[PDB]
Amino acid sequence: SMEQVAMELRLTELTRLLRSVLDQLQDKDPARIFAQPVSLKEVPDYLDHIKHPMDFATMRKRLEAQGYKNLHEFEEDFDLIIDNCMKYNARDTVFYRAAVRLRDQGGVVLRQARREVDSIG
């Protein structure tokens, strides 16, 4: 059906819009703390602490596979990155501090991006 192609033309363009957004959110992590998944060889207890791990490269895998059906799904992953970090790491730490900085600066990019989804459909 041509009605599936029109949906795909919309999901293609969401992926194209979220691709841009992800870049801006990851330009807010120049220390690249959140780039890669937390190592299981280097933090073997990790999954005892954190049950849904998340990182930018993982979010990018899903993204290029057209695995985000809407913006809300994409925001959920972003918050997993931040919130996982802020429970796993204590408050006087470089890792926690980076999560907070990324949350504060992400709120501006996401506030615009919610409008470009609503506006452009």
Swiss-Prot record:
The Bromo domain, residue ranges: 9-113
Organism: Homo sapiens (Human)
Subunit and partners: Component of some HBO1 complex composed of KAT7/HBO1, MEAF6, ING4 and BRD1/BRPF2. Component of the MOZ/MORF complex composed at least of ING5, KAT6A, KAT6B, MEAF6 and one of BRPF1, BRD1/BRPF2 and BRPF3. Interacts (via PHD-type zinc finger domain) with unmodified histone H3. Interacts (via PWWP domain) with dimethylated and trimethylated 'Lys-79' on histone H3.
Gene that encodes the chain: BRD1
First-to-last residue of the parent protein present: 555 to 674 of 1058
Tissue expression notes: Highly expressed in testis.
Protein name: Bromodomain-containing protein 1
Positions bearing the Glycyl lysine isopeptide (Lys-Gly) (interchain with G-Cter in SUMO2) cross-link: 41
Localization per record: Nucleus; Chromosome
Function: Scaffold subunit of various histone acetyltransferase (HAT) complexes, such as the MOZ/MORF and HBO1 complexes, that acts as a regulator of hematopoiesis. Plays a key role in HBO1 complex by directing KAT7/HBO1 specificity towards histone H3 'Lys-14' acetylation (H3K14ac), thereby promoting erythroid differentiation.
Disulfide bonds: none
